Write a protein that binds this ligand. Structure first.
Ligand SMILES: Nc1nc2c(ncn2[C@@H]2O[C@H](COP(=O)(O)OP(=O)(O)OP(=O)(O)O)[C@@H](O)[C@H]2O)c(=O)[nH]1
Ligand SMILES: Nc1ncnc2c1ncn2[C@@H]1O[C@H](COP(=O)(O)OP(=O)(O)CP(=O)(O)O)[C@@H](O)[C@H]1O
Ligand SMILES: O=C(Nc1cccc(Nc2cc(Nc3cccc(C(F)(F)F)c3)ncn2)c1)C1CC1
Ligand SMILES: Nc1nc2c(ncn2[C@@H]2O[C@H](COP(=O)(O)OP(=O)(O)O)[C@@H](O)[C@H]2O)c(=O)[nH]1
Ligand SMILES: [Ca+2]
Ligand SMILES: [Ca+2]
Ligand SMILES: [Ca+2]
Ligand SMILES: [Mg+2]
Ligand SMILES: [Mg+2]
Ligand SMILES: [Mg+2]
Lengths: 439, 425, 351, 54
């Protein structure tokens, strides 16, 4: 067994990590005080779930997690909430004043004075690991902490753990749920500084999640609680192979091998089905065919875009529940004759399939219905570059007038870091269009 | 980012500041003696932002009251909530400032300013996490204008990294004590342009017109004018004073509202416009009135400019779905008036606790290029006297040179140019 | 009040659609780059489909189908017909055609082109071909000139069977091509406009001199200049449907619907049904319509041939009024309701 | 449609179906950048206090 450390940065990263660790506990039957009645090796072990939990002599199962925020109120809600006993005080790190939606404030000014305490609390966890593989990093593109401190952290982690793998779960900015006009700036800055330090990055557009919540959960105006419980179901799908016995994606290196041939194009699109309101009076359960087919509707993606108009480089299907290979292969053969799925020429047209027989777990009292089978598709398609174009356009509208730049320069940043980051993004967009478009 | 320090300077500054502490002490359940008395415990989750808590769990405003003569502060100490204020925080001289910016900034005010800063330093030192300052003052007199801007310069020296916000009453010939108000205002704006993060521009002209044409008051007093200012000040600060999803602080507003450091003069608005009726307002009605120029407090036509940013704060229990539809409707119907080069520059917030006497209300904070009309007016009134050097002897007799007037007028005309650049961009 | 933007100023059709939208008094034109639009009359090249449908509170519609260029580019069309099972190599209404890259570029079909070209050397059949790119037209029964002329150019060409025995109108013994206008709305209703036009040659066809390219190239521009009998028989080399029907009635004893149109509706419906899964915007976050120009030729046995699909067609002068009103009717007001000239193409044969 | 590397266990199975074949800066260099931005902050702050001193 090889351990994984989860790093949650800033408000979005902390609230999403809360949602995920709650889900993990339900799935592995770990109670809020950290007791796991079914773990019969008291005080130790190296089962699959120990990738994410350590054990104490008292039989307490402790997340391999560190929560970091430049301001205390969100992590204070962790310290006083339902899972207060779950975490050790030293794993919950807060500053005093936050980065004020300012990348440079979180990176240069306030980051510089807390980065060393964080790396030391992170080494405290690495030290209880027999063979650490690396890191799951949760953060928003748009917050000053989530962008600026996360990029500082990523650079330093490459320095202090240069062999380990680094995976990101990133919240892409959506105006419907954001109170900041500078999120495009922060997004570009942090993507530029983090790109080479990340092996695999799963982007979640708050706008897609918001509309899935309205459309399929009948929630009129979703809150962060609604968004996060859905996002955590998806994250759970993606990490179940690290936490459960199986043979697909069993360590972090395999996510890069299976999903990322070209290391800069490391942004798989996630699609999830079915999402069913728990208040839905009467529901006919969806078959393997119907949920697999739903994996190819844009309305079920984590990022609205159109994979019909790009090319695929890899595809993983991750099923939970009552599924067997014959149903999957029949569903694929049907879908292939009815949909525009084009792969890049130097890749096999094919699917890696993982089936875990336990159906998805839902938070009691949440919005999501229990279902008999569900699926998460991870596809590396060039169509996700659409989300970069959107973001880059917004950045270009503001930066042409230098709107808000002075807030960044006043933190130590140089104006030229803006156009550096922007030109890296332009390289990125051209990479995508080379791999995915014919003349 | 938690405690805020409030300063009120001169006559207008203290009359409006007193009304502000009345209004928000009513919202937070605090009574004129400092004792809490409400129902919701959310009257006190963020009570520390504006109140220091003393022994007996008694709440004392983090308020410094400044004046160069004792008249208005003896009125405040006799006023409704006059006992609320920490008596050590009344700092006053005896001589007055004679509606003379030079006496407030350079002579009388200079004598007094260090003792004011001593009270500020003591209020800051007892703060876990001071986030910045607000100042209430007019720009047309001498104390609030001249000493008020002297204070701001001193506070920036000693706290260069805290947020500085002003609530600044603009002089108007229609509501006017003296002919030198355009001189005082121009000298003051030159200070405000450099040393504040946010300036809420309240035109006495606009308050007068609202009271007359909308509240149907034929003879508006300063008391009726200040009722509208304290209602707007309440709405503008409600997000900082009550728990909600936003977790509002000073800096994020400053960061997101101010795309260029000198263009930080905001147009405030309030809806529904009331005068101390029982009709329920709909969310579509709130949203239309909030954006109405007749509900705005700086006498500028938003249709003559372009919005750089917009904060809309709704108060009370209403549909978020309907608020977001109505908000999205005004932008998508009048999109030419929002600059296209700041994507998504209209942000909205909701506080579930409504103000006293209303079930639903909205506050508008606009960074519009039409605020240039305010500075043009002042500049025309200024130049009309300055080209004949009229009334200058009141200032040169305090040490000032004509050159200092010519520089302040040039800076204000520069700020008018800056605004006109982005109205055409 | 709906809002729209225009980003192609060289578009007669959508210039007229723009004016018609304004004159309703319920549509407002915004600036070319204001994102807060309901409708985008977009550019022909590099239209930014990936920025559509992300404006909260705005249903967005555009007048182009992302991906329809696979129909509106000669090489794309050939690839699409030869590789789509539902069109297939055994496609009876498309001329035999091969994709040819220049030698400076070296995939390519010159291999298989000569294999069939020999069976017309061997088989004594008429081995004339035409070469064209997506000016630059060569008709010749010698493949050696075709492939030489293509390498002399820089871009991909297609070598296509030249239809040597076309139906020629009398009086004239002269060529023509038919242009149909087809509107595809956001629901993927396929609407053929009831008025077509015959782009006619005013020179007697002559099968001996394939280099005199004025009785062989019925293009309205090549006939406006290089042709000496422009305007003789009809005004501007344009015959409309009422006449062509009457001529067919009088000359051949048949009608336009039976002898030609059934085949045209079959071809239009087949092409648009083929690419429907690739381009439909049924469950997408923005919506598309698009106007196409379909170009047909009729041989002497009254067999219709598809020549080319045009994704940005101009309309015919006298028809602009009726067509652009019809676009607004079924493509725009269908989506944005204010306060038939088309035949709907649909067919459900059970088997 | 080839099914390959099928693995089975108590908790599930995994496999691969093929439809078609194929047709960093150092701790020092980071510390420098974080210090070259702090010096730019200290400069800007000094220029402000110099201006306030005039
Ligand atoms: N899905 C989701 N998005 C969130 C959540 N919280 C914040 N966001 C998004 O993240 C962006 C704002 O960033 P934050 O994470 O709150 O900022 P931060 O990282 O804490 O950094 P500061 O600027 O210092 O406060 C916006 O796009 C928000 O909508 C959350 O709990 N769930
Ligand atoms: N296989 C073929 N056989 C006989 N004639 C052909 C032919 N292909 C094209 N033509 C003739 O050339 C003309 C069509 O040329 P082409 O298909 O390249 O259109 P174009 O793109 O140059 C202008 P537009 O796009 O508006 O129609 C027709 O008028 C037709 O007479
Ligand atoms: O500052 C004062 N009032 C005040 C009012 C509202 C919010 C905040 N504070 C914030 C704002 C923010 N983003 C934000 C950006 C633009 C608009 C909006 C809004 F308001 F429209 F929702 C929110 N994020 C965190 N805190 C402060 C008075 C001067 C003392
Ligand atoms: N809105 C409002 N304006 C006032 C009030 N008192 C004075 N003013 C205006 O403020 C200016 C005079 O400034 P004032 O505060 O009296 O002088 P100071 O005591 O030296 O600061 C003039 O433009 C007056 O119209 C008041 O109570 N409310
Ligand atoms: Ca164990
Ligand atoms: Ca690395
Ligand atoms: Ca004295
Ligand atoms: Mg935060
Ligand atoms: Mg006075
Ligand atoms: Mg002293």
């Amino acid at each position: 067994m090889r351990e994984c450390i989860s790093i949650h940065v800033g408000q979005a990263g902390v609230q999403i990590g809360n949602a995920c660790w709650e889900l993990y506990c339900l799935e592995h039957g770990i109670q809020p005080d950290g007791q796991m009645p079914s773990d019969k090796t008291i005080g130790g072990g190296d089962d699959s779930f120990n990738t994410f939990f350590s054990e104490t002599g008292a039989g307490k199962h402790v997340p391999r997690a560190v929560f970091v925020d430049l301001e205390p109120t969100v992590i204070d809600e962790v310290r006083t909430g339902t899972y207060r006993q779950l975490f050790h005080p030293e794993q919950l790190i807060t500053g005093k004043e936050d980065a004020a939606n300012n990348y440079a404030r979180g990176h240069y000014t306030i980051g510089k004075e807390i980065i060393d305490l964080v790396l030391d609390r992170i080494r405290k966890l690495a030290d209880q690991c027999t063979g650490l593989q690396g890191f799951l990093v949760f953060h928003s593109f748009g917050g000053g902490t989530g962008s600026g401190f996360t990029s500082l952290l990523m650079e330093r982690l490459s320095v202090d753990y240069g062999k380990k793998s680094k995976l990101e779960f990133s919240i892409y900015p959506a105006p419907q749920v954001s109170t900041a006009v500078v999120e495009p700036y922060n997004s570009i800055l942090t993507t530029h500084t983090t790109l080479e330090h990340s092996d695999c990055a799963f982007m979640v557009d708050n706008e897609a999640i918001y509309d899935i919540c309205r459309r399929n959960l009948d929630i009129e105006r979703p809150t962060y609680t609604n968004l996060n419980r859905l996002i955590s179901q998806i994250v759970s799908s993606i990490t179940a192979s690290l936490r459960f016995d199986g043979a697909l994606n069993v360590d972090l290196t395999e996510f890069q091998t299976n999903l990322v041939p070209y290391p800069r194009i490391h942004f798989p699109l996630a699609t999830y089905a079915p999402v069913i309101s728990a208040e839905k009076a009467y529901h006919e359960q969806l078959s393997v065919a119907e949920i697999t087919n739903a994996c190819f509707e844009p309305a079920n993606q984590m990022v609205k875009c159109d994979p019909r108009h790009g090319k695929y480089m890899a595809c993983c299907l991750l099923y939970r529940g009552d599924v067997v290979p014959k149903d999957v292969n029949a569903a694929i053969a049907t879908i292939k004759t009815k949909r525009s799925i084009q792969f890049v020429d130097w890749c096999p047209t094919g699917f890696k399939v993982g089936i875990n027989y336990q159906p998805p777990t839902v938070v009691p009292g949440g919005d999501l219905a229990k279902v008999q089978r569900a699926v998460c598709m991870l596809s590396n398609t060039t169509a996700i570059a659409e989300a970069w174009a959107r973001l880059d356009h917004k950045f270009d509208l503001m930066y042409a007038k230098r709107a808000f730049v002075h807030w960044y320069v006043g933190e130590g940043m140089e104006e030229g870091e803006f156009s550096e980051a922007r030109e890296d993004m332009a390289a990125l967009e051209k990479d995508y269009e080379e791999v995915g478009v014919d003349s | 980012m938690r405690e805020i320090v409030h300063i009120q300077a001169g006559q207008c500054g203290n009359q409006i500041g007193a009304k502000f502490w009345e209004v928000i002490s009513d919202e937070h359940g605090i009574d004129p003696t400092g004792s809490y008395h409400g129902d919701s415990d959310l009257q006190l989750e963020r009570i520390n932002v504006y109140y220091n808590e003393a022994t007996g769990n008694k709440y004392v405003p983090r308020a410094i009251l400044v004046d160069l003569e004792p008249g208005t502060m003896d009125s405040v100490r006799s006023g409704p909530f006059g006992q609320i204020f920490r008596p050590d925080n009344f700092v006053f001289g005896q001589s007055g400032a004679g509606n003379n910016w030079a006496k407030g900034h350079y002579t009388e005010g200079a004598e007094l300013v260090d003792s004011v800063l001593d009270v500020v330093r003591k209020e800051s030192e007892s703060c876990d996490c001071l986030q910045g300052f607000q100042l209430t003052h007019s720009l047309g007199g001498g104390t609030g204008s001249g000493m008020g801007t002297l204070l701001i310069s001193k506070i920036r020296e000693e706290y260069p990294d805290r947020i500085m916000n002003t609530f600044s009453v603009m002089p108007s010939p229609k509501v006017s004590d003296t002919v030198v108000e355009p001189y005082n205002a121009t000298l003051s704006v030159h200070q405000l342009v450099e040393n504040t993060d946010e300036t809420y521009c309240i035109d006495n002209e606009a308050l007068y017109d609202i009271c007359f044409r909308t509240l149907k008051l034929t003879t508006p007093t300063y008391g009726d004018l200040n009722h509208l200012v304290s209602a707007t000040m309440s709405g503008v600060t409600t997000c900082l004073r009550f728990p909600g999803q936003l977790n509002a602080d000073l800096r994020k507003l400053a960061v997101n509202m101010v795309p260029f450091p000198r263009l930080h003069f905001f147009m405030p608005g309030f809806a529904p416009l009331t005068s101390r009726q029982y009709r329920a307002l709909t969310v579509p009605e709130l949203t239309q009135q909030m954006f109405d120029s007749k509900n705005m407090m700086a006498a500028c036509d938003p249709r003559h400019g372009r919005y750089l940013t917009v904060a809309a704060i709704f108060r009370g229990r209403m549909s978020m779905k309907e608020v977001d539809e109505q908000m999205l409707n005004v932008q998508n119907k009048n999109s030419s008036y929002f600059v296209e080069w700041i994507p998504n520059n209209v942000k909205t917030a909701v506080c579930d606790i409504p103000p006293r006497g209303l079930k639903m209300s909205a506050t508008f904070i606009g960074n519009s290029t039409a605020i240039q009309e305010l500075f043009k007016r002042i500049s025309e009134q200024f130049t009309a006297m300055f080209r004949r050097k009229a009334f200058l002897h009141w200032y040169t007799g305090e040490g000032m040179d004509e050159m200092e007037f010519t520089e302040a007028e040039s800076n204000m005309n520069d700020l008018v140019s800056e605004y006109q650049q982005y109205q055409d961009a | 009040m709906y809002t729209f933007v225009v980003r192609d100023e060289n578009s007669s059709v959508y210039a007229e659609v723009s004016r018609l939208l304004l004159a309703t008094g319920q549509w407002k034109r915004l600036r070319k780059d204001n994102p807060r639009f309901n409708l985008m009359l977009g550019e022909r090249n590099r239209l930014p489909f990936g920025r559509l449908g992300h404006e909260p509170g705005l249903v967005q519609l555009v007048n182009y189908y992302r991906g329809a260029d696979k129909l509106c580019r000669k090489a794309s069309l050939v690839k699409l017909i030869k590789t789509s099972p539902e069109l297939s190599e055994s496609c009876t209404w498309f001329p035999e055609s091969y994709v040819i890259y220049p030698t400076n570029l070296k995939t390519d079909e010159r291999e298989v082109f000569l294999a069939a070209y020999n069976r017309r050397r061997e088989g004594r059949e008429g081995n004339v071909w035409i070469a064209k790119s997506s000016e630059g037209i060569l008709i010749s029964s010698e493949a050696s000139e075709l492939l030489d002329f293509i390498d002399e150019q820089g871009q991909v060409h297609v070598i296509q069977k030249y239809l040597e025995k076309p139906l020629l109108l009398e009086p004239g013994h002269r060529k023509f091509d038919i242009r149909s206008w087809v509107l595809v709305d956001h629901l993927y209703n396929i609407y053929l406009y009831r008025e077509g036009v015959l782009r006619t040659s005013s020179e007697p066809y002559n099968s001996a001199n394939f280099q005199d390219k004025t009785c062989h190239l019925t293009n309205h521009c090549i006939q406006k200049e290089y042709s000496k009998n422009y305007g003789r028989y009809e005004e501007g080399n344009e015959m409309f449907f009422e006449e062509f029907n009457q001529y067919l009635m009088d000359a051949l004893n048949t009608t336009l619907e039976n002898s030609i149109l059934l085949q045209i509706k079959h071809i239009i419906r087949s092409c648009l049904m083929c690419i429907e899964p690739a381009i439909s915007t049924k469950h997408l976050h923005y919506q598309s319509f698009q106007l196409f120009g379909f170009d047909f030729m009729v041989d002497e046995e009254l067999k219709v041939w598809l020549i080319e699909v045009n994704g940005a067609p101009a309309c015919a002068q006298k028809l602009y009024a009726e067509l652009c009103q019809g676009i607004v009717d079924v493509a725009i007001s269908s989506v944005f309701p204010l306060a038939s000239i088309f035949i709907k193409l649909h067919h459900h044969h059970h088997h | 449609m080839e099914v390959i590397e099928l693995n089975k266990c108590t908790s599930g199975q995994s496999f691969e179906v093929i439809l078609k074949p194929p047709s960093d800066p150092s701790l020092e260099e980071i510390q420098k950048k974080l210090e070259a931005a702090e010096e730019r902050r200290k400069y800007q702050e000094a220029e402000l206090l110099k201006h306030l001193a005039e």
